[PDB]
Amino acid sequence: MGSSHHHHHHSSGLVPRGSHMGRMVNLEPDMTISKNEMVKLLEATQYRQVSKMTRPGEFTVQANSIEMIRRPFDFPDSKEGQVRARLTFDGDHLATIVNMENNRQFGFFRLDPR
């Protein structure tokens, strides 16, 4: 058990408010994204937010960004080494991504949804 955030009140009959799944992965700065869009990124890095992360298959969603560590994934379209990426929101919408190792700018971080 690590970073166990409780208070999971399921919306039994989520008719109002609208659809809120969001599941979207294509990291491309100046995109309008959420923990719920990147959620898939997070399901992709197969992780859940941490106070602090560093291992393959993590991320952090806390303040202005959704960070991440690409665990080795065996996808035909995506199979590489680990990367710490900084998905920084202009508040509501992702503005930039930064390679947290070099602190260089992104503008492409592509995942393979699943």
Describe what this molecule looks like in 3D:
The PDB classes it as transferase. The entry lists the keywords UB2H domain of PBP1b, regulatory domain, transferase. The assembly is monomeric. NMR structure of UB2H, regulatory domain of PBP1b from E. coli. By secondary structure, the chain is mainly β. The protein has one domain (1-114). It is built from one helix and five strands, in the order αβββββ. A five-stranded antiparallel beta sheet has the order 1-2-3-4-5, with no helix packed on it. It is globular, with a radius of gyration of 14 Å. The two termini are 23 Å apart.
Name the descriptors.
monomer; 114 residues; mainly beta; five-stranded antiparallel beta sheet; 1 helix; 5% helix; globular; Penicillin-binding protein 1B
Q: Please state the overall shape, judged from the principal axes of the Cα atoms.
A: globular
SSE ordering:
HEEEEE
**Sheet with the most strands, sense and barrel status:** 5 strands, antiparallel
Discrete helix count: 1
User: How many distinct folded domains?
Assistant: 1
What's the arrangement of secondary structure elements?
Blueprint (H helix, E strand, L loop, with lengths): L38 H6 L13 E4 L3 E5 L14 E7 L2 E7 L4 E2 L9
